[PDB]
């Protein structure tokens, strides 16, 4: 909602920063074995815990 506590807003802030694509240079690293961010979350498919 519009009325939110600081903890809830701070919690939403962290979930927002970590929902980004992996940097491209990562695949160039030796022994990368990572293709894409498997922890991507869309607001409509899956809802946050809180």
């Amino acid at each position: 909602s519009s009325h939110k506590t600081f903890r809830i807003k701070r919690f939403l802030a962290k979930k927002q920063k970590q929902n980004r694509p992996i940097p491209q240079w990562i695949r160039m690293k030796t022994g990368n074995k990572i293709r894409y961010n498997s922890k991507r979350r869309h607001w409509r498919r899956t809802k946050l815990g809180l």
Binding site: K9, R10, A13, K17
Partner: protein
């Protein structure tokens, strides 16, 4: 416009800008961004210009 520490209040922002930029400020407006960082709108005193201060700060 500055990005400040989330624990700093308006009084602390006012003193911080005053000493390390040698300017006088009129008021400080504060919000916390959706990314979690705190943003401060620091309005300078009328006798100070925000354009040359930004020029010597280096954010032109």
């Amino acid at each position: 416009v500055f990005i400040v520490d989330v624990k700093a209040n308006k009084h602390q922002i006012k003193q911080a800008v005053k000493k390390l930029y040698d300017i006088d400020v009129a008021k400080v407006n504060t919000l916390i961004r959706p990314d979690g960082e705190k943003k401060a709108y620091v309005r300078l005193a009328p006798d100070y210009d925000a354009l040359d201060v930004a020029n010597k700060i280096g954010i032109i």
